[PDB]
Symmetry: C2
Subunit: 237 residues, 2 copies
Amino acid sequence: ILFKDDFNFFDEKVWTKETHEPGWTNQELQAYDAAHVSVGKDGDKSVLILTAERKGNKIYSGRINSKGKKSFKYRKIEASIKLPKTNGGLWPAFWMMGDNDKQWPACGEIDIMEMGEQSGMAAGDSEKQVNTAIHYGPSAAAHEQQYYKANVANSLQDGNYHTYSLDWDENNLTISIDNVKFHTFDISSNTYFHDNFYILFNLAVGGAFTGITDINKLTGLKDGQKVNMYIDWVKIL
Amino acid sequence: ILFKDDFNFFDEKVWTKETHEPGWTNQELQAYDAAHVSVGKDGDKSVLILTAERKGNKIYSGRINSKGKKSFKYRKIEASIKLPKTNGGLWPAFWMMGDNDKQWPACGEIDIMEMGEQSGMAAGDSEKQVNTAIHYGPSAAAHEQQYYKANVANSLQDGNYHTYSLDWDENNLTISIDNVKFHTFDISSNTYFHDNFYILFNLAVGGAFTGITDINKLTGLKDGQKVNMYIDWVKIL
Ligand SMILES: CC(=O)N[C@@H]1O[C@H](CO)[C@@H](O)[C@H](O[C@@H]2O[C@H](CO)[C@@H](O[C@@H]3O[C@H](CO)[C@@H](O)[C@H](O)[C@H]3O)[C@H](O)[C@H]2O)[C@H]1O
């Protein structure tokens, strides 16, 4: 184990909490702030807690990253995450971007896990439908993305922690869920995935991906409701 | 050349015109019927024509396939297609499904070209943004999909014909647009892409892919409007 965070405390030497207004990316409904990121207890477990909350028409949630603090290359990254029910507009993600100063998507993006996509709600398997993706290109106008989407066998929103893994070498990005291979992206001649990448976790609320960008269609998070995303640990082997 | 249709006439030994109610697939707004498929002339060019039109709240368009009539395996297929401006909910596609009686998606699906996606309008490059994809898996519950999307250099909705190509061997599916390689899907160990596939062309109107499933939001086909998708030719080499 080269690195492990058990989230006994919020380590500011590793993580930064983000602050953005609604609409900052992907027509998202939440404001990100420091107050909706905490470390706490879930039973016997030390966990990072991202809390989505709604008061009136105002929506808050949490997002952290290890940019300029913790980045790695050609190593295995795993995180144990307990996801909320996403149906009706929640958008949790475990992902990485290039640890350099290049504007997105030139920095590179690996989406290890996201749930909450529009089509999953329409098909009635929002609890099983996972997206994994890579984004790259020298600019936004030249943005390129590869996706794989599938239902896993059983609910990942089942009140349990699940293991999300990326295996990374010169040739391949291999995503696994509870130690079962989900998909492999070929990067052997992709120039954007051979540098240091930092880690992100967030719980977005609505946005293009969920197909919900009007608070009137946000059934997934109600007035007075708080909803948590729990990360028990993250490690780099 | 194994096969070439110049569309001097509609050959019922190769092609079948499809009839479906609105919302048959993907929450699409259009009815498909035989009256909205024709063969005719675009100047000197003999063309297959798929016509989308709106009479009040009734939307009609055209869809054809060569199931049980014309299918192939490990051949290059190209088509020369002129597209309408898709912005505001039009959804043209050139694609393939396995020539067997397995229920979708166990038949396999190759989407060589589709345009008109939500994100294309949101990225203000609706004339340039193309999706390519493969769908497979034993049931609708176990639906798996790989997709690539990017903007091509030049408008594909510019009043001219463009060439859409699939190269297909036992290892690779390679989509090209105007002889520029767009994406390669690895099918080397994917069991769903090693039998005969038939061809489809269609012009859907609205649907989940467009993010417009409500006729009130459909700005791309107004009341009293008529739009044409033109295929000059298709060939298998
Ligand atoms: C690339 C992309 O985003 N979408 C795919 O492209 C094509 C062309 O744009 C879409 O039309 C596909 O939609 C899927 O097509 C299947 C075959 O037409 C549909 O399957 C059919 O479903 C009906 C109703 O349930 C059944 O009665 C038919 O037997 C079955 O073939 C499927 O529902 C639809 O999602 C995209 O895959």
